[PDB]
Structure 1
Amino acid sequence: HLTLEQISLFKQLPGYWGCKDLNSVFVYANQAYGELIGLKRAEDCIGRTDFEMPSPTAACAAEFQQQDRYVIETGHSVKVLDIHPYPDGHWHAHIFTKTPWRDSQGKIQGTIFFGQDLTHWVCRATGLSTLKLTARESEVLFLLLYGKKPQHIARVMGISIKTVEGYEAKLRSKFGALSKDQLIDLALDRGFGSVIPKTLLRKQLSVVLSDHTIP
């Protein structure tokens, strides 16, 4: 049994978090998440789905559920880049971690979500050492660097697949790469993975980002 002292940690652990059941119906949300999502008491999340929150995030409720079902059917954990206008009238950006929620004998009974606010050197063989992209180009590049395929990028940005190939070709040539693989390596070796394009921060989207341990 937990002391009240330890329960205050439960109440004050920073971030935007909670859990849903197998139908992605909310079971708990901490106060920070409830306020974010437009509610004065986070208890009003319980029993509702992502479609039913008074918040523009509900326009991506179908993406949230597909994410949730992936964690549930596979047991893998995912990292989601979430960028949305919110009931407070501001755009926010988060990485939401999603992991399976397990019961007392270990079986998956839902998902846990945990969100955090998102607030010219070259790599050499050993060490480091020492081109102007379009808004559209830098958006396509950022998504390609995190493992997203062209049909993924077409959906996120709301353009045709052929158009993503258009921007991919410019990038490949702007970096002087002879293939998409070389484009990725060259861009990574120049710090392109560590910056979110500022125009991407005003495009509503929910996309899983490929994630790897370092090293």
Structure 2
Amino acid sequence: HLTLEQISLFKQLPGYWGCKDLNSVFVYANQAYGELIGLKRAEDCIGRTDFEMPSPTAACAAEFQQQDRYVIETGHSVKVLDIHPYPDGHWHAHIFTKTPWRDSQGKIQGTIFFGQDLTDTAILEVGHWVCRATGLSTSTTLKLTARESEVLFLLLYGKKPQHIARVMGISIKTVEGYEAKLRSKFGALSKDQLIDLALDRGFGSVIPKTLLRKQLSVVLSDHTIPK
């Protein structure tokens, strides 16, 4: 059995986290998540779905549940970029980790969600260094528009044009125009080479500022470093 001292760690572990059952009905949410989602007491989440929270995040509950069902049906964990207006009147950005929740015999019985704030330390501007065979190099242009920057960021995290068009609220053909502009600016011969050239220049380290005021919930491809 846990001591009260250890239970205080359960109460104080940072982040925004909880678990849901197989129908994405909340089973627990910590106090930080409850306050973020507009509730006075986080216990008031229990028995509700994402559609039923007093929060604009509920506009994206279908996407949350599609992510949950993917975790449940494959057993894979995902990382989700979540950008929403919240009942406190501010836009927030988080990465939510979603993993299977298992019972005592190892069977999947729901999902665990674990969110961390994206701070200004993650919204830097792109530098001017380039990966080399050894070390790095810099000069002494790749100036991108807002839409171009948003398309590039999503491409670098594994998103297809159909995903990007749905995230940005534009047509697939419009995304292809931005892809072509990006390929020209980077001098890339292919979409795959565009990704390589952009990654070697630090474009993966920067969330475009205009993305921080677009409501979205999108799984980001995630791989260990190094690999």
Quickly name the TM-score band, shorter chain normalised: over 0.9
The 1:46–1:83 alpha-carbon spacing in structure 2 relative to 1, beyond 3 Å, is same
Q: What is the aligned partner in structure 1 of residue 170 from structure 2? A: 159
Q: Deviations over 1:108-148 (max 9, x none)?
A: 00000000000x10000011199210100000000000000
Deviation at 1:93, TM superposition (A): 0.3
In structure 1, the gaps of 5 or more residues are none
Task: State the aligned residue count.
Answer: 214
The 1:8–1:59 alpha-carbon spacing in structure 2 relative to 1, beyond 3 Å, is same
Rounded Cα–Cα distance in structure 2 between residues aligned with 1:207 and 1:19:
19
Rounded Cα–Cα distance in structure 1 between residues aligned with 2:204 and 2:51:
32
Rounded Cα–Cα distance in structure 2 between residues aligned with 1:161 and 1:183:
18
Which aligned segments of 4 or more residues in structure 1 are displaced greater than 6 angstroms? none
Deviation at 1:183, TM superposition (A): 0.4
Q: What is the aligned partner in structure 2 of residue 122 from structure 1? A: 130
Q: What is the aligned partner in structure 2 of residue 200 from structure 1? A: 211
Identity over aligned residues, as a percent?
100
Q: What is the aligned partner in structure 1 of residue 123 from structure 2? A: none
SS of the equivalent of 1:34 reads helix
Rounded Cα–Cα distance in structure 2 between residues aligned with 1:170 and 1:130:
13
**Structure 1 residue 182 corresponds to structure 2 residue 210:** no
Bigger CA drift: 37-46 or 123-132? 123-132
Rounded Cα–Cα distance in structure 2 between residues aligned with 1:172 and 1:138:
12
Deviation at 1:51, TM superposition (A): 0.1
SS of the equivalent of 2:111 reads strand
Rounded Cα–Cα distance in structure 1 between residues aligned with 2:193 and 2:10:
46
Rounded Cα–Cα distance in structure 2 between residues aligned with 1:74 and 1:187:
31
Query: TM-score scaled to structure 2, two decimals?
Result: 0.93
Deviation at 1:54, TM superposition (A): 0.2
Rounded Cα–Cα distance in structure 2 between residues aligned with 1:167 and 1:131:
14
Rounded Cα–Cα distance in structure 2 between residues aligned with 1:131 and 1:104:
53
Rounded Cα–Cα distance in structure 1 between residues aligned with 2:142 and 2:101:
46
Q: Deviations over 1:124-179 (max 9, x none)?
A: 00111992101000000000000000000000000000000000000000111111
- The Cα RMSD (Å) is 1.2
1:121, 1:130 within 8 Å by CA — same for their partners in 2? no
1:122, 1:130 within 8 Å by CA — same for their partners in 2? no
Listed as ranges, the matches of 1:95-174 within 5 Å are 95-118=95-118, 120-128=128-136, 131-174=142-185
Rounded Cα–Cα distance in structure 2 between residues aligned with 1:103 and 1:178:
49
Rounded Cα–Cα distance in structure 2 between residues aligned with 1:207 and 1:61:
12
Rounded Cα–Cα distance in structure 2 between residues aligned with 1:160 and 1:21:
35
